[PDB]
């Protein structure tokens, strides 16, 4: 339960190469004398795997993931590796798939196991008359809520701790396909010391149990043998690899056994075998794949610098509306400049709820409403959500999910007119609380206490509708203030006002993603000498394809060329002759990808010789390749 081992010696993290291993049957379909291809979670060839041992100086049991493919190839000498541990989090919170082996049966239980930091098995009492008997069981602590149990056939496992070179090889592939856990097994005798044989081995399915759990991490159950923290293991080594959904070509004999497999996505010589569907490829040039340049960045040079919003009729208008019967205006399809007001340092209160005004230049919205009225000096704090006053309780209440702006500035020299300004009214009393975006034009007498007013004024009875009034000889709290209340929202319409940083440029000589006014895709811009008309924004060729655009800010004409693409050809020799490669990337130079440029494309792998010979393998433009000394 809490027993840990301290007999682990530090080793450098080396790796092991896999030449032609990691091929199993994708299904239960009998195929004979055919060359068919399949695509499933197989091991890619010429890859590097991890380095773990299960011996008496290295004893490792890490926590490795499961979703990135699991390839378990291990050599066994003294029967140390017994089973495997699967599960989501490997604790009591989620389910776990536990496979144990007590040298009599392969016990598979699906319960809520609680594992420790290093599960193992105990083979102890090796002083005298040992006979390799099991002593302890330290896999898990407890289990509850079991759902499945599988008992295999009984057998006799030799628990003798033999040393020396390995004589057995066991390969396993674990995966989960919609809850059905499939286990592949293959056993073949080998003769090596440390590494794995660089040959071929086809794995066969053994069991298929409908577990139905999610597996994200997995471990490996090991044993201990020595002739509670000082015990050592026997002689074993396991290498864990990752599977990738690649294309593999399988060869079937008359008996249906897979004899050879070639990974298609490894080298261009292997791409010819999967295209022609033949393991024996003669001398010639064949199509292998298709080349495509991957873009790096993605800029959107869609909007221009014109079409500014006329904010002079909203902030500096001649007359606003009332605070209880206001008229909401819609302003869209323009560019609202809000940075010249925050940096002016002349506003009394410049705040914006939802999005800060420093972030409004880099934030997109659908539209923006307007709500302009004239308030007093003490009513600046009243136009705010979650507040009170003569406006927030009687005239206009802001909602909790407010995404607009509260803009305030001193307008003592603006609202001062000859004879006074009495064109604005406000409510002073109300019978109940307010609602968000609610108007009120009633003139009913408010009743404060239990005494009725009977429609006339008196004790705690006043008229709700009052008029504004200000004097220049008053204090700060009685000055008129012009305020503009905004309202941002998101609709099904696209964004019309965001603010494109008041400046736009154009990047050329690079295949990247672009989003223009009449073309969206990947391309690389080059210099040109064309002259566009002042109303045109983009140009097309005779093929009705946009290949020339215009900068919306700079008066320059730059044509856009799309990124290079085309088929990939190779020059392949005979199967029993050589395995050299010469990749030919068509419709591209030798810079965007034995270097020689042709009219068909860049050829990498062939040395340019000035001497002329007979054309063996044709390429194009009078250039051919051959195999000479």
């Amino acid at each position, epitope marked *: 339960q809490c027993v840990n081992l301290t007999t682990r010696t530090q080793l450098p993290p080396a790796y092991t190469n896999s030449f032609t291993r990691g091929v199993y049957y994708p299904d239960k379909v009998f195929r004979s004398s055919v060359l068919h291809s399949t695509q499933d979670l197989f091991l890619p060839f010429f890859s590097n795997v991890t380095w773990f041992h299960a011996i008496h100086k290295r004893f490792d049991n890490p926590v490795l993931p499961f979703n990135d493919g699991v390839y378990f190839a291990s050599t066994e000498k003294s029967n140390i590796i017994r089973g495997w541990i699967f599960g989501t989090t490997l604790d009591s919170k989620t389910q776990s798939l536990l496979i144990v082996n007590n040298a009599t049966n392969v016990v598979i239980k699906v319960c809520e196991f609680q594992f420790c930091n290093d599960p193992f098995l105990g083979v102890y009492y090796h002083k005298n008359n040992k006979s390799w008997m099991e002593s302890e069981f330290r896999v898990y602590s407890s289990a509850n809520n079991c759902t499945f149990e599988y008992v295999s056939q009984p057998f006799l496992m030799d628990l003798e701790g033999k040393q020396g070179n390995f004589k057995n090889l066991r390969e396993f592939v674990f995966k989960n396909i919609d809850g059905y856990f499939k286990i592949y097994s293959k056993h073949t005798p080998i003769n090596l010391v440390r590494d794995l044989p660089q040959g071929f081995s086809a794995l066969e399915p053994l069991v298929d149990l409908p577990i139905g759990i999610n597996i994200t991490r997995f471990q490996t159950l090991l044993a201990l043998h020595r002739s509670s923290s000082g015990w050592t293991a026997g002689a074993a080594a396991y290498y864990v690899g990752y599977l990738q959904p690649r294309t593999f070509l399988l060869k079937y004999n008359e008996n249906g056994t897979i004899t050879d497999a070639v990974d298609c996505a490894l080298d261009p010589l292997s791409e010819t075998k999967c295209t022609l569907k033949s393991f024996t490829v003669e001398k010639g040039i064949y199509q292998t794949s298709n080349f495509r340049v991957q873009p790096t960045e993605s800029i959107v040079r869609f909007p221009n610098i014109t079409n500014l919003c006329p904010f002079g009729e909203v902030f500096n208008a001649t007359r606003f509306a009332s605070v209880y019967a206001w008229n909401r205006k819609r302003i869209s399809n323009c560019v609202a400049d809000y940075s010249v007001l925050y940096n002016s340092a002349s506003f*009394s209160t410049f705040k914006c709820y939802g999005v800060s005004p420093t972030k409004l230049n880099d934030l997109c919205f659908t539209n923006v409403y307007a709500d302009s009225f004239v308030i007093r000096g003490d009513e600046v704090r009243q136009i705010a959500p979650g507040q009170t006053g*003569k406006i927030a309780d009687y005239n206009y209440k802001l909602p909790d999910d407010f995404t607009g702006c509260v803009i305030a500035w001193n307008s003592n020299n603006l609202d001062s007119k000859v004879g006074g300004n009495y064109n604005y009214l406000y409510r002073l009393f109300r019978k109940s609380n307010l609602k968000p975006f609610e108007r009120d034009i009633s003139t009913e007498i408010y009743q404060a206490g239990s005494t009725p007013c009977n429609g006339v004024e008196g004790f705690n009875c006043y008229f709700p509708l009052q008029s504004y009034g200000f004097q220049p000889t008053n204090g700060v709290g009685y000055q008129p203030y012009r305020v503009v209340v905004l309202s941002f929202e998101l609709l099904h319409a696209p964004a019309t006002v965001c603010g494109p940083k008041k400046s736009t440029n154009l990047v050329k000589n690079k295949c990247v993603n672009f989003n223009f006014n009449g073309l969206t895709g990947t391309g690389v811009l080059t210099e040109s000498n064309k002259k566009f008309l002042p109303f045109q924004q983009f140009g097309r060729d005779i093929a009705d394809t946009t290949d020339a655009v215009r900068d919306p800010q700079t008066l320059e004409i730059l044509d856009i060329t799309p990124c290079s693409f085309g088929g990939v050809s190779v020059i392949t020799p005979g199967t029993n002759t050589s395995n050299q490669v010469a990749v030919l990337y068509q419709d591209v130079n030798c810079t965007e990808v034995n270097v020689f440029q042709t009219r068909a494309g860049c050829l990498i792998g062939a040395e340019h010789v000035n001497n002329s010979y007979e054309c063996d393998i044709p390429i194009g433009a009078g250039i051919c390749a051959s195999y000479q000394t």
Partner: antibody, heavy 118, light 108 residues
């Protein structure tokens, strides 16, 4: 601007509560002055608000058991609670919420403790 | 209603370090960020309003910034008298209730 809280130490039940918060440095003519109480154990509760018109609205927990008055000549405002009980035992505080000279001023006092029980 | 999820409710810093209190809002608040400082045995006081300007009378060691939903109070050179509970106040609707609170402690 500095506020000061005052009140009796113990209040008999089934009576009228009395509190006094004086506002020094500025007369109460523009802004909003609140009454926020705090239970022992770092738990504050907001009761209600008072507007400039005089009509007040409170929480639904205290519908007609709290009255807030103000006076523009004495530069202070009072707090009265009718039908007091053991739930009103809290540490009251006073604050000032107003704008001016492009700054957000929020000044507080010291605090008073009123213990009401049966 | 927007609840300010406090990342730290109890911090132990020394004199001269930087206090980092982060109140991640569930929705977009913008200038709806308020910082209060309630000393033990004293009254609370508004420290940072609208995440742009400090209160009059506060020294220059208290500052703060942020945008969107990520707001972090910056207290440089915290003295011994700064041991108080910091609350993140929202102006969504009434009542004017406070949050959980972040109490600072001298590391001993």
């Amino acid at each position: 601007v500095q506020l000061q809280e005052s009140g009796p130490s113990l209040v008999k039940p089934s009576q009228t509560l009395s509190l006094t918060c004086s506002v020094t440095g500025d007369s109460i003519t523009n802004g909003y002055w609140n009454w926020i109480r705090k239970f022992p154990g770092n738990k504050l509760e907001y009761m209600g608000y008072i507007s400039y018109s005089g009509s007040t609205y409170y929480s639904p927990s205290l519908k007609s058991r709290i009255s807030i008055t103000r006076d523009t000549s004495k530069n202070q405002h009072y707090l009265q609670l009718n039908s007091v009980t053991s739930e009103d035992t809290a540490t009251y505080y006073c604050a000032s919420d107003y704008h001016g000279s492009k700054y957000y001023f929020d000044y507080w006092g010291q605090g008073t403790t009123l213990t009401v029980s049966s | 209603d927007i609840v300010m999820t406090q990342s730290h409710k109890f911090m132990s810093t020394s004199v001269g370090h930087r206090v980092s209190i982060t109140c991640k809002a569930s929705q977009d608040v913008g200038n709806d960020v308020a910082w209060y400082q309630q000393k033990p045995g004293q009254s609370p006081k508004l420290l940072i309003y609208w995440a742009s300007t400090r209160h009059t009378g506060v020294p220059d060691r208290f500052t703060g910034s942020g945008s969107g939903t990520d707001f972090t109070l910056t207290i440089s050179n915290v003295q011994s008298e700064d041991l108080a509970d910091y609350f993140c106040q929202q102006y969504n609707r009434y009542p004017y209730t406070f949050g959980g609170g972040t109490k600072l402690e001298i590391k001993r």
